Write a protein that binds this ligand. Structure first.
Ligand SMILES: CCCCCCCCO[C@@H]1O[C@H](CO)[C@@H](O)[C@H](O)[C@H]1O
Ligand SMILES: CCCCCCCCO[C@@H]1O[C@H](CO)[C@@H](O)[C@H](O)[C@H]1O
Ligand SMILES: CCCCCCCCO[C@@H]1O[C@H](CO)[C@@H](O)[C@H](O)[C@H]1O
Ligand SMILES: CCCCCCCCO[C@@H]1O[C@H](CO)[C@@H](O)[C@H](O)[C@H]1O
Ligand SMILES: CCCCCCCCO[C@@H]1O[C@H](CO)[C@@H](O)[C@H](O)[C@H]1O
Ligand SMILES: CCCCCCCCO[C@@H]1O[C@H](CO)[C@@H](O)[C@H](O)[C@H]1O
Ligand SMILES: CCCCCCCCO[C@@H]1O[C@H](CO)[C@@H](O)[C@H](O)[C@H]1O
Ligand SMILES: CCCCCCCCO[C@@H]1O[C@H](CO)[C@@H](O)[C@H](O)[C@H]1O
Ligand SMILES: CCCCCCCCO[C@@H]1O[C@H](CO)[C@@H](O)[C@H](O)[C@H]1O
Ligand SMILES: CCCCCCCCO[C@@H]1O[C@H](CO)[C@@H](O)[C@H](O)[C@H]1O
Ligand SMILES: CCCCCCCCO[C@@H]1O[C@H](CO)[C@@H](O)[C@H](O)[C@H]1O
Ligand SMILES: CCCCCCCCO[C@@H]1O[C@H](CO)[C@@H](O)[C@H](O)[C@H]1O
Ligand code: NA
Ligand code: NA
Ligand code: NA
Ligand code: NA
Lengths: 509, 509
């Protein structure tokens, strides 16, 4: 089985798995919509009671499965719980990352497309003070790129450039993945992460120099880091914070588990896991939190900045920030650096979310790495046409897989590993070979607190937030639901084939 | 490998494969729309130059593949032409029947649902002379059953009864298929075909007694059997006739090939194939042609009857005929007998079109018959939800698979078998073990005439009839196109897995 070559490589690859679009695009919007400072308390708590513990648990499950030649959940869940239902629940560990990849790689391709256009200077020209006269050109720019509906039909018409850039993006993902864990992903991470860090720091510095009649970047930081305890009673803020924690750390995606399946049996995961997690949090709150929000607040003030964040999920990063940059000397190039940053952040994450399917095809169906990578790319490429052309399909997939799915799967993996497999056996497995030991208190957090925390969250979620959304949607949401349910059925069939191949092979030996 | 137990069983199963909804629903509409008698000349010619020859060719290919343990085209095409492209082209032999099954079984379920409701008397009550006051209740009846759109959204809302009946229908198909070729399909055919014949004859007799101020059943027969040579120059009529010939004989579906793969290596296929084909033609022109059209003409006259046929594909069989029957004593029960006839005709055909996928899973992926049948039913059941809920999805699938697909595949199988594999080797393979020999003239028809006939047809088709339809359709057609293209990709992936299992198994022996 492949293995990470170096400790540093392992840490940077895991860091790249986590540090992505979630840090620079998702976090700012989530924090801004939920009162900035009021979002941070629940966020910090969620990191300590959910983020950290689940991270160790996934690293442990992955290393454990890898030692037996298995890197994905259908097999690993079965090793931890010899029950047919374990294999079925394990399918979510392939389904969630596949579905997220289907829309994540497309958004990633937009950042490459924008980077290219900003680099060559093929960008809108704002009319040298009206805020709408400056923002409109950038909104039209994004709308023409992805092809937002002008009529009443829920259809998108992406530009030819956008389509070709998606193809190029898939090619780049394949060019890294096809070389494997050590020579592909690990080698790339050592180049991408340092670049990402430098670009991010530079951008924060440039943003910190912004000052207008409406405010300064400093005002943005105070809005984000000023606590509002009167919001700690709001369930919505807790749901938002926990959701962000899962997404940003790649938890419940089956991705951390698959990467960890390449860690040697004796190798530490306690310190390595904690380091990867801490690196992501720094990139998120210090870098991601210091670019978009402060820039928006400085130019528009808090009230307007928050309104912009609520406007959409892409408004801030694809329309507002470049518009703001366009008002400064060298602003077009700064826009290029922003999109290039987003691209590398996205790329290091998309290779991580597609590796689970690759690992399954290699480990369970015995496909060569080449064939496994190519078929995975084909399924993602084909499936992405739904997100490219059907308005709101992206939103639907992000909801079921990227929001509900990850939380549900996180609770599922915890219950299989810490309750069914055995709390003490699990604790023993996590600490084995550790450079440091997990604080004793976390044994009780993992066994009682984390699972109770998530169970409640999911309950309040399903009875006070979904009944409304799961009934007021346009009929076209069923097209996406139908298709992703089919993807689940397809993956279940592959797991069935994998078990039949195992039986036949065994009976032959 | 399984084999048909008796010669009679083989003939009745093949006859059941062919005699279906195409005979009683499709033929009447096709003939009526294309000038009745004017349709029959091209139809007869198509049967002689296309129907008969391709039938022998498919039986030959199937028996040939079966002798080597292969019943589906991905493998058989490869045996006839050792080229990777042969395996890919062969995928259509699994894709076409799967797609047709996805809508065919649903229409079949409607006949069971209607049979049930007509039997118990839960049918509309026409107001005891206005033609619309009598037809409207039956139109509303069908519309409420399948859930035709009342607004502008292209969405269907089938009744709960219709949905449950579809489930029951799938169960019945599974209950026959799971028992296999001899104890399942063959045993059922010996019971279904005789029943079908008796019900059909009885219905023809009852229809022949109809006489109204507008005409008699006799007028219907003269409309159908009176030649109109001024239409022999119309390409559209030729396309219609050839299309019906393929559909009614199950040619280009990969279904005749799979059934023939269970015929013993030495067993005759010349006489058996010809008999199955002739039986279908009798059931089609004599039985199918003598029920719907004569009844409609007798009550409405020719002009109105033709208009009704053009109105829709289901108008005549699900609305008009029962409406006509309702005006006669015992008419509700006659309606029950009609739908029961359609159900048995459909059932004997749906088991035939689902067997190719079952044979592939058993032959190439080594699944047990139980597992192969259940997974096939699951894929069809799941996929059918698209046809159940998206208006016109059924039409789109029928077009690509049931109309264009079968013709294209028929030309493909002929060129692989008679040109690539070898005209003389093919001719030798067809006649081997024959109780009778194929007339010498057919050697030249198969090698030069049939392929030229179809090639021209397809060309005129693609440059004078599709450019118009492939551009004026509602955007929702892309949902169905997207999904069935995905089905093709899925099946291609399974063929890829089958070849890898073969390689690994071989290297182990
Ligand atoms: C291999 C899978 C193919 C699926 C069909 C894809 C059809 C995409 O079609 C392409 O879309 C682009 C973006 O709108 C357009 O700019 C191109 O002109 C158009 O040909
Ligand atoms: C790095 C890869 C860059 C690929 C550039 C693709 C440019 C697409 O090509 C452009 O498409 C436009 C919309 O259809 C047309 O109006 C332009 O004339 C055409 O040049
Ligand atoms: C890492 C990339 C994350 C992209 C986040 C996608 C979120 C799903 O999509 C977003 O949903 C919001 C609420 O329904 C809408 O207001 C936004 O307009 C929409 O883009
Ligand atoms: C779910 C995947 C749907 C893929 C549908 C792709 C349709 C191809 O793309 C469409 O082609 C038309 C004709 O050239 C153009 O008029 C449309 O603007 C273009 O979007
Ligand atoms: C709610 C989660 C809080 C996590 C903070 C843990 C801080 C670690 O706490 C330390 O753990 C060591 C090992 O068990 C003990 O020996 C120390 O006395 C204790 O202070
Ligand atoms: C392939 C497309 C399948 C669509 C299935 C639609 C099932 C009906 O879906 C319903 O349609 C109503 C009217 O639009 C909406 O108001 C409801 O919210 C929606 O759930
Ligand atoms: C296992 C695959 C399940 C796919 C979701 C199917 C949802 C069907 O839903 C059912 O449709 C029927 C017909 O309109 C209605 O009468 C039922 O009330 C409704 O629950
Ligand atoms: C042979 C199998 C027969 C199954 C009969 C199913 C009858 C469905 O049940 C009926 O559905 C209607 C529409 O939702 C309701 O209005 C009726 O009250 C209910 O009894
Ligand atoms: C054996 C069952 C055959 C069913 C025939 C389905 C034909 C596809 O569907 C039919 O297409 C016609 C032309 O586009 C329309 O006029 C009909 O209303 C439509 O039902
Ligand atoms: C392509 C397959 C689409 C399956 C969509 C099934 C949607 C379930 O069915 C829908 O449920 C709604 C709420 O109960 C009802 O209001 C709708 O009338 C009903 O059609
Ligand atoms: C265009 C297709 C026409 C098919 C009709 C074939 C009628 C059979 O024709 C017969 O075939 C025998 C065997 O070759 C010959 O010995 C006879 O002389 C010949 O009349
Ligand atoms: C999942 C749904 C994907 C839909 C892809 C639609 C691609 C655009 O498709 C085009 O839309 C036009 C406007 O409706 C129609 O007039 C054209 O005939 C149609 O080809
Ligand atoms: Na992250
Ligand atoms: Na990343
Ligand atoms: Na037929
Ligand atoms: Na039949």
């Amino acid at each position: 089985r492949e293995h990470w070559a170096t400790r540093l490589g392992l840490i940077l690859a895991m860091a790249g798995n986590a540090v992505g679009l979630g840090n620079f695009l998702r976090f700012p919007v989530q924090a801004a919509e939920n009162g900035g400072g009021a979002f941070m308390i629940p966020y910090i708590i969620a990191f300590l009671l959910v983020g950290i513990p689940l991270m160790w648990i996934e690293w442990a499950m992955g290393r454990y499965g890898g030692a037996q030649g298995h890197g994905t959940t259908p097999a690993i869940f079965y090793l931890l719980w010899r029950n047919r239902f374990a294999k079925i629940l394990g399918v979510f560990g392939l389904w969630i990352p596949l579905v997220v990849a289907i829309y994540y790689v497309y958004i990633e391709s937009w950042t490459l497309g924008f980077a290219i256009k900003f680099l060559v200077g093929l960008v809108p020209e704002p009319p040298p003070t009206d805020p709408d006269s400056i923002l409109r050109p950038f909104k039209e720019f994004l709308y023409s790129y992805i092809g937002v509906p002008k009529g009443d039909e829920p259809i998108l018409k992406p530009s030819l450039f956008a389509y070709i850039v998606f193809l190029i993006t898939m090619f780049i993902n394949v060019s890294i993945l096809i070389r494997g864990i050590s020579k592909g992903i690990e080698r790339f991470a050592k180049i991408a992460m340092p670049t990402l860090f430098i670009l991010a720091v530079f951008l924060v510095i440039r943003v910190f120099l912004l000052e207008t009649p409406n405010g300064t970047a400093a005002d943005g930081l105070n809005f984000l880091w000023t606590p509002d305890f009167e919001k700690l009673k709001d369930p919505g803020v807790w749901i938002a914070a926990v959701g962000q924690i899962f997404f940003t750390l790649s938890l419940g995606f089956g991705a951390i588990i698959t990467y960890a399946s390449y860690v040697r049996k004796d190798q530490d995961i306690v310190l390595s896991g904690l380091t990867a997690a801490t690196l992501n949090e720094k990139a998120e709150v210090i870098l991601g939190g210091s670019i978009s929000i402060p820039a928006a607040v400085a130019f528009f003030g808090v009230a307007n900045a928050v309104a912009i964040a609520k406007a959409g999920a892409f408004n801030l990063g694809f329309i507002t920030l470049p518009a703001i940059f366009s008002q400064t000397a060298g602003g077009t190039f700064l826009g290029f650096l922003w999109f290039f940053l987003l691209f590398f952040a996205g790329l290091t994450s998309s290779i991580a979310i597609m590796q689970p399917m690759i690992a399954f095809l290699e480990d369970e169906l015995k496909l060569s790495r080449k064939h496994a990578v190519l078929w995975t790319a084909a399924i993602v490429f084909f499936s992405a046409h739904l997100v490219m052309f059907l308005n709101k399909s992206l939103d639907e997939m992000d909801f079921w897989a990227g929001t509900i799915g990850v939380v549900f799967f996180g609770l599922t993996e915890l219950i299989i590993f810490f309750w069914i497999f055995g709390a003490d056996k699990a604790w023993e497995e996590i600490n084995r070979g550790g450079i440091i030991k997990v604080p004793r208190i976390y044994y009780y957090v993992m066994r009682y607190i984390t699972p109770a925390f998530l169970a409640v969250l999911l309950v309040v979620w399903a009875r006070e937030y979904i009944p409304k959304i799961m009934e007021e949607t346009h009929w076209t949401v069923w097209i996406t639901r139908f298709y992703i349910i089919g993807l689940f059925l397809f993956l279940t069939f592959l797991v069935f084939l994998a078990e039949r191949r195992r039986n036949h092979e065994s009976a032959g030996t």
